Design an enzyme around this catalytic site. Structure first.
Site, PDB file in Angstrom:
ATOM      1  N   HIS A  92      30.018  20.185 -10.214  1.00 22.42           N
ATOM      2  CA  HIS A  92      31.346  20.578 -10.747  1.00 22.42           C
ATOM      3  C   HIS A  92      31.254  20.876 -12.238  1.00 22.42           C
ATOM      4  CE1 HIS A  92      32.929  18.909  -6.963  1.00 22.42           C
ATOM      5  NE2 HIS A  92      33.783  19.930  -7.122  1.00 22.42           N
TER       6      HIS A  92
ATOM      7  N   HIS B  54      29.369  26.338 -11.849  1.00 21.76           N
ATOM      8  CA  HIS B  54      30.357  26.406 -10.746  1.00 21.76           C
ATOM      9  C   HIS B  54      31.542  27.272 -11.183  1.00 21.76           C
ATOM     10  CE1 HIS B  54      32.942  25.432  -7.441  1.00 21.76           C
ATOM     11  NE2 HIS B  54      33.825  24.876  -8.248  1.00 21.76           N
TER      12      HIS B  54
ATOM     13  N   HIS C 177      39.234  26.299 -13.283  1.00 17.00           N
ATOM     14  CA  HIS C 177      39.838  25.604 -12.114  1.00 17.00           C
ATOM     15  C   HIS C 177      39.327  24.163 -12.014  1.00 17.00           C
ATOM     16  CE1 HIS C 177      36.147  26.254  -9.837  1.00 17.00           C
ATOM     17  NE2 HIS C 177      36.619  25.394  -8.928  1.00 17.00           N
ATOM     18  N   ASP C 178      38.197  23.824 -12.640  1.00 16.37           N
ATOM     19  CA  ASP C 178      37.608  22.454 -12.553  1.00 16.37           C
ATOM     20  C   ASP C 178      37.362  21.873 -13.955  1.00 16.37           C
ATOM     21  OD1 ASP C 178      37.527  21.579  -9.855  1.00 16.37           O
ATOM     22  OD2 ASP C 178      35.732  22.790  -9.450  1.00 16.37           O
TER      23      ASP C 178
ATOM     24  N   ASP D 147      36.262  29.083  -4.393  1.00 16.61           N
ATOM     25  CA  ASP D 147      35.816  27.701  -4.676  1.00 16.61           C
ATOM     26  C   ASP D 147      34.702  27.279  -3.714  1.00 16.61           C
ATOM     27  OD1 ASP D 147      35.775  25.358  -6.114  1.00 16.61           O
ATOM     28  OD2 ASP D 147      37.302  24.415  -4.886  1.00 16.61           O
TER      29      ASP D 147
ATOM     30  N   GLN E 144      27.172  19.120   7.560  1.00 12.62           N
ATOM     31  CA  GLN E 144      27.301  20.550   7.151  1.00 12.62           C
ATOM     32  C   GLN E 144      27.957  21.353   8.277  1.00 12.62           C
ATOM     33  OE1 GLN E 144      27.043  20.046   3.936  1.00 12.62           O
ATOM     34  NE2 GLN E 144      26.156  22.077   3.741  1.00 12.62           N
TER      35      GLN E 144
HETATM   36  C1  LIG Z   1      29.211  24.402  -0.526  1.00 13.96           C
HETATM   37  N1  LIG Z   1      29.729  23.139   0.064  1.00 13.96           N
HETATM   38  C2  LIG Z   1      29.110  22.324   1.054  1.00 13.96           C
HETATM   39  O1  LIG Z   1      27.988  22.596   1.590  1.00 13.96           O
HETATM   40  N2  LIG Z   1      29.946  21.184   1.308  1.00 13.96           N
HETATM   41  C3  LIG Z   1      29.733  20.138   2.209  1.00 13.96           C
HETATM   42  C4  LIG Z   1      31.083  21.333   0.450  1.00 13.96           C
HETATM   43  C5  LIG Z   1      32.213  20.547   0.273  1.00 13.96           C
HETATM   44  C6  LIG Z   1      33.224  20.944  -0.642  1.00 13.96           C
HETATM   45  N3  LIG Z   1      34.390  20.139  -0.909  1.00 13.96           N
HETATM   46  C7  LIG Z   1      34.641  18.884  -0.211  1.00 13.96           C
HETATM   47  O2  LIG Z   1      33.874  18.514   0.703  1.00 13.96           O
HETATM   48  C8  LIG Z   1      35.893  18.089  -0.597  1.00 13.96           C
HETATM   49  N4  LIG Z   1      36.002  16.971   0.341  1.00 13.96           N
HETATM   50  C9  LIG Z   1      36.598  17.138   1.683  1.00 13.96           C
HETATM   51  C10 LIG Z   1      35.801  17.348   2.868  1.00 13.96           C
HETATM   52  C11 LIG Z   1      36.413  17.483   4.114  1.00 13.96           C
HETATM   53  C12 LIG Z   1      37.833  17.400   4.198  1.00 13.96           C
HETATM   54  C13 LIG Z   1      38.631  17.169   3.000  1.00 13.96           C
HETATM   55  C14 LIG Z   1      40.050  17.073   3.076  1.00 13.96           C
HETATM   56  C15 LIG Z   1      40.807  16.855   1.935  1.00 13.96           C
HETATM   57  C16 LIG Z   1      40.185  16.728   0.694  1.00 13.96           C
HETATM   58  C17 LIG Z   1      38.793  16.819   0.597  1.00 13.96           C
HETATM   59  C18 LIG Z   1      38.033  17.034   1.770  1.00 13.96           C
HETATM   60  S1  LIG Z   1      35.441  15.401  -0.016  1.00 13.96           S
HETATM   61  C19 LIG Z   1      33.996  15.123   0.928  1.00 13.96           C
HETATM   62  O3  LIG Z   1      36.497  14.383   0.405  1.00 13.96           O
HETATM   63  O4  LIG Z   1      35.193  15.289  -1.513  1.00 13.96           O
HETATM   64  C20 LIG Z   1      33.061  22.128  -1.446  1.00 13.96           C
HETATM   65  C21 LIG Z   1      31.943  22.912  -1.259  1.00 13.96           C
HETATM   66  C22 LIG Z   1      30.948  22.520  -0.295  1.00 13.96           C
HETATM   67 MG   LIG Z   2      38.162  21.241  -7.960  1.00 21.60          MG
HETATM   68 ZN   LIG Z   3      35.684  23.933  -7.730  1.00 21.18          ZN
END
Ligand SMILES: Cn1c(=O)n(C)c2cc(NC(=O)CN(c3cccc4ccccc34)S(C)(=O)=O)ccc21
Ligand SMILES: [Mg+2]
Ligand SMILES: [Zn+2]
Length: 313
Positions: A68, A72, A106-107, A217, A269
């Site tokens: 992040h 990014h 955005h981050d 994103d 994944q």
């Molecule tokens: C490129 N890439 C990738 O390969 N993976 C695994 C990636 C995950 C995210 N982003 C999250 O995985 C965010 N999260 C969530 C996951 C599932 C349901 C949620 C539902 C609500 C909120 C958050 C959720 S978390 C785990 O809780 O932090 C962004 C980019 C990714």
């Molecule tokens: Mg964010």
């Molecule tokens: Zn982001």
């Protein structure tokens, strides 16, 4: 006024493609961003001096976290650049200005922890903002940097145009809260299928910009396999640190974040591609047909994760 940014030939060609990687040379990312603003928006959208001072204050307020981070920010802005350039006539002058800035910001000042970890830690930001905790913080930091002296890149807009663009940015940045994505895409699905999707309905545009923001994103899942695979290490490095901090609070984290359950990553994944990414780019391709290359690249990478599970790499 007559001072264009030009990129080396390979970058000049590859930057137009969705799967473009901004590369490992940090010092070129500001130039890449400006190049994109100038072609996406015009050489006259922003006073170059102000833009450059804005870009460098924004860079300074991204932290050195594995995922992040400043890279990014520029990756997500590039994806938005690709969507805007493949959908030239669908977007207003204000929307093109606001969205590349929204993506870069955005981050802002992300610490590498989810909204959930702030809430269980009882972080002050979780008292100040009960939902979309980090995303309301990111918008707040955007407004702070816009209010530094010499940093108002929108100074030439009218009072009402300025409020319109800051409102595009706020909605755009809030939409990057993935908790909000699920319902937003379901509604865009229903609207598209019943044929009620109307791009002149401001509340419909808002939703469509929200989905573009989720799409940009998540755009690491739409790169060529070696980029996607190497970025997944950065993502999981943050997740496992968060898992560690959950265990420090006496909370077993979800397996995705547990570094003892690395074995379960490839299946996780699949989950993520099937539950989040594929639905996201599918709905986006329905609403914006020229964004299809993102769906195709996402599917190719799902197939590559399936191969990882089947021992074929
Ligand atoms: C490129 N890439 C990738 O390969 N993976 C695994 C990636 C995950 C995210 N982003 C999250 O995985 C965010 N999260 C969530 C996951 C599932 C349901 C949620 C539902 C609500 C909120 C958050 C959720 S978390 C785990 O809780 O932090 C962004 C980019 C990714
Ligand atoms: Mg964010
Ligand atoms: Zn982001």
């Amino acid at each position: 006024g007559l001072m264009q940014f030009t990129l080396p030939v390979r970058l000049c060609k590859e930057i137009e493609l969705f799967h473009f990687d901004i590369g490992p040379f940090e010092n070129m990312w500001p130039g890449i961003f400006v190049y994109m603003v100038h072609r996406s928006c015009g050489t006259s959208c922003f006073e170059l001096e102000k833009l450059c001072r804005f870009i460098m204050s924004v860079k300074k307020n991204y932290r050195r976290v594995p995922y992040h981070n400043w890279k990014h920010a520029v990756t997500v802005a590039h994806c938005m650049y690709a969507i805007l350039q493949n959908n030239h006539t669908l977007f207003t002058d204000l929307e093109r200005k606001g969205l590349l800035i929204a993506c870069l910001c955005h981050d802002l000042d992300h610490r590498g922890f989810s909204n959930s970890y702030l809430q269980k830690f009882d972080h002050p930001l979780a008292a100040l903002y009960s939902t979309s905790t980090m995303e309301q913080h990111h918008f707040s930091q955007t407004v702070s940097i816009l209010q530094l002296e010499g940093h108002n890149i929108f100074s030439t807009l009218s009072s009402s145009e300025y409020e319109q663009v800051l409102e595009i940015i706020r909605k755009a940045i809030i939409a990057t809260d993935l908790a909000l994505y699920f319902g937003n895409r379901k509604q865009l699905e229903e609207m598209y299928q019943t044929g009620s999707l109307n791009l002149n309905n401001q509340s419909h545009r808002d939703r469509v910009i929200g989905l573009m923001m989720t799409a940009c994103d998540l755009c690491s899942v739409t790169k060529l396999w070696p980029v996607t695979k190497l970025t997944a290490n950065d993502i999981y490095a943050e997740f496992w640190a968060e898992g560690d901090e959950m265990k420090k609070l006496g909370i077993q984290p979800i397996p995705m974040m547990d570094r003892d359950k690395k074995d379960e990553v490839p299946q996780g994944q699949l989950g993520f591609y099937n539950a989040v990414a594929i639905p996201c780019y599918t709905t986006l391709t329905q609403i914006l047909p020229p964004t299809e290359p993102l769906l195709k690249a996402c599917r190719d990478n799902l197939s590559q994760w399936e191969k990882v599970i089947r021992g074929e790499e």
